[PDB]
Amino acid sequence: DDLVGFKLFLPEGPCDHTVVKLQPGDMAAITTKVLRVNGEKILEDFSKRQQPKFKKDPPLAAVTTAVQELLRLAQAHPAGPPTLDPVNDLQLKDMSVVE
Incomplete structure (x- = not known):
C-alpha cells in the first residue's frame, strides 16, 4: 500500500496547517493539480500571525481555502493522483527513465 504511488496522508486530528521552509529533497512529488493560491497574501498573513501574541487571530480566507483544497485533494484520490511525469507530462x- 506504501510502494504504489504516493500515500495520501489523512490527518488523525483536526485539519491544521503549517508553513515550512522545505528543501528540494523533502518533497516526494510534484503533483499535476493546479491550485491557484496567492503566495503574497499567505505570506502577509502567516508572517503577521506567527507572532506568539497574535498567533490566535481568526484565519484568513485564502489560508482556510488552501487548507480545505489540500484536504479535499487528499480525500479525492484513493492512493494518490498521478504526478507530472518526467516524460509523459x-x-x-529519455529511454532510461522509461525503463
Missing part, C-alpha cells in the same frame, strides 16, 4: 524522451 514534461515532454521528455
Whole structure:
C-alpha cells in the first residue's frame, strides 16, 4: 500500500496547517493539480500571525481555502493522483527513465 504511488496522508486530528521552509529533497512529488493560491497574501498573513501574541487571530480566507483544497485533494484520490511525469507530462524522451 506504501510502494504504489504516493500515500495520501489523512490527518488523525483536526485539519491544521503549517508553513515550512522545505528543501528540494523533502518533497516526494510534484503533483499535476493546479491550485491557484496567492503566495503574497499567505505570506502577509502567516508572517503577521506567527507572532506568539497574535498567533490566535481568526484565519484568513485564502489560508482556510488552501487548507480545505489540500484536504479535499487528499480525500479525492484513493492512493494518490498521478504526478507530472518526467516524460509523459514534461515532454521528455529519455529511454532510461522509461525503463
